[PDB]
Amino acid sequence: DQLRQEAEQLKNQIRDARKACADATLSQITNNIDPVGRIQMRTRRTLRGHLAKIYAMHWGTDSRLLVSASQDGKLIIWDSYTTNKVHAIPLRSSWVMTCAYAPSGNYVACGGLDNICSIYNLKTREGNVRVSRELAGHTGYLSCCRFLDDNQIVTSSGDTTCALWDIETGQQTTTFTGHTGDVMSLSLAPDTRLFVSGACDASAKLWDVREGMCRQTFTGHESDINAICFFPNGNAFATGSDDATCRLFDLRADQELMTYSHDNIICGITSVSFSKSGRLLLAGYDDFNCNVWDALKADRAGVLAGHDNRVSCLGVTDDGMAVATGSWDSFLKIWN
Amino acid sequence: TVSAEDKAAAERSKMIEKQLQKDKQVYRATHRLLLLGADNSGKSTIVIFETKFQVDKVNFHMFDVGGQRDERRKWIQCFNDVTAIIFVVDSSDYNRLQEALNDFKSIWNNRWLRTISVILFLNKQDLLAEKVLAGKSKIEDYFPEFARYTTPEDATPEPGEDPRVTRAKYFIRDEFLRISTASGDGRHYCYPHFTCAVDTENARRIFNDCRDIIQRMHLRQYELL
Amino acid sequence: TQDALYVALELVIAALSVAGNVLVCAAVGTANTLQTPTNYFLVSLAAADVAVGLFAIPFAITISLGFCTDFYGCLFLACFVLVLTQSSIFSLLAVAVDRYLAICVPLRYKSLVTGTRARGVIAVLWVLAFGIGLTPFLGWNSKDSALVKCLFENVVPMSYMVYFNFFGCVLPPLLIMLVIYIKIFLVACRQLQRTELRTTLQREIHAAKSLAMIVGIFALCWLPVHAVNCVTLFQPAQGKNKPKWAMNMAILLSHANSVVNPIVYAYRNRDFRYTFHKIISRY
């Protein structure tokens, strides 16, 4: 048909335009920096109390409290300084895969296989944690929800679309439907202006909040994409796949920059995170241990082998003082 | 150096821990089951999203997920500790049967369900009996190999039925057992049953075969099976 | 000559027992996956075995040497030895009943075995062992017959070990274990007859071999001592004149159980092997 011929012409145009801008490879320009060395991290605190496998964990703005969700159907709010439990909120559905902590520190969020996103209010007057709002517009299972401010939220589900919700009115304002498969990761820019999404189609896309249109797409993977994160400067992002590889992308170049992989790794990637200076990349794997990579040299730095099952979650504080790791052993570990 | 605030925090943590201990006690002593089937299988009327029921002072939980689509490979990783998986298969529609067999293959061969047993329920036997008693059945057309089949000697037909209906009834069970026999041994097996729409003995059957699954796992753990 | 061999072998047995039994307790303590209600009985058995290997044996050579002291300074050592030895048999019975409960009552195993009930059972077992062992101090002694030569037969009479410590503390556990391990074998044979329809016989023989050794080792280790005691008590004509080392061999066989318990019960399980492999590879 004429339409498919035009599509092929446009794809070839995009390919040659991308190829034109390639100036130099990263290995040739990174061969003069001083190597990081060997990083040794030891466990400081182990938090117990969960019953089943643990599926999410988010820190706070003050690097003081954290929230954990497990298959038992309960949210736990800890205090990492003294290993206390501030709150334990029961749930209505035993299946949960999302958590979020509001930057202001007054709200928490949850979601799972019940196709509904629940918002809980913490700083109440009666002393009991009460559910504020429930959002039930999606048709697929939710994968991750992240706050923007005290009155806006963004959600991704298995219905191949992402949505933006306003809490007070209860009705979504803008939906993004450019994908062809299950969207299962998203991260926010530090300036809260753009955000990226990773799908089941071995692809990632960058969206604009008010514009509502996909502005730039990236591909190159061969299998599913499981996690994604934003560089602190807001100009790059790293993605993890089931091909046992991590890939770093820049937005201004519309091209791959670095690939981290090794022949001795076969399992899949389930969580990715950055450090404060952007010099360290932390990646959780499926073979019961995590790994540390140098973002500018593509070399190993150390292994945080301290678990007995899958390491599902990964988080880094705002000040970068500690690293939190969850797992399916119903245990959380804090490293420094 | 402990102030009043620290004491209040300790008291709150102790109360939370006591409630958690009670929840763990009430949780660890229950069994979980996941139900699977297709549309028109009749999976909602065998005993809707969740169900609790007890038999002989033993608890049982029934789970159903139906808000998703044909692909299910993503959320099946959570159910890696279920005691058994219940599968409901219709037998009235011959055309929409081969497809069902395909849905049985992946479940038997998924890498996250390598040590999970499956209980089969062949539903709607009255409809099959009425259809095969009448002359509009064309089983050979939808399945070419039916002509050479003969009733096994190990079969135990229920007295008071046509031989044709028992032959056709065991034919369907043959292909479902063939997939189980072809791959997988020593970690999981299949337990066939012939369930009608009005039957009330399903709970007893689930009790009996779940007991067998648990006993087999416990015998295997001490390495004497 | 003979006494030197006896004491040397007892010391070797104590050393091997302590070395073998410290590892099980360390592995249970340092592993999160092994903190299950079943493993508490195993760690109690290991603790009893290491306590025996550290205290009971040296007290045994102290008693059997034949030195002079006060009457009440010797009965204490004898009763301590008895308590420490009885705790092991009680722990064996506890692990046997725990093993039976899971196999022969499959669906209700989780609701009946919890941490609280296991801890209570362990405490009751140890308290009962202490109560049984210290009975002679209540007045079942041989002071009226008789500063005092320390021999085991001089302080505690033979009318106590045969009638109380054998007919009410050793035999019923052996009968219970025999019944349990016959019923488990029958269940496993039925489950293999159903399974088959190697060969069925080659897998039945393996199960029989695995289940026979648990009872055989116990029967070989505990029976001879009380057989000699009964021979001494009932028929004096044979009891009065027997070779001295016959009793020493029975003592050695009775104390040799502490080194064979961990091998049979602990090192054979898959979880312990996996934990040991992981620890060895990491370190």
Add this chain to the structure above:
Amino acid sequence: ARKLVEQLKMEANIDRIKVSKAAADLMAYCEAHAKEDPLLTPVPASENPFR
């Protein structure tokens, strides 16, 4: 669809910059914040709140 071909149109006119400048900016950002990264350069135990 007729909208899919339209979508690809605005995905090609966006200006693109040579990778060298992006790499230089990334290096500058990485090296300008190296002294305030506790994980890369460990802090003394006096100021560490996890002891």
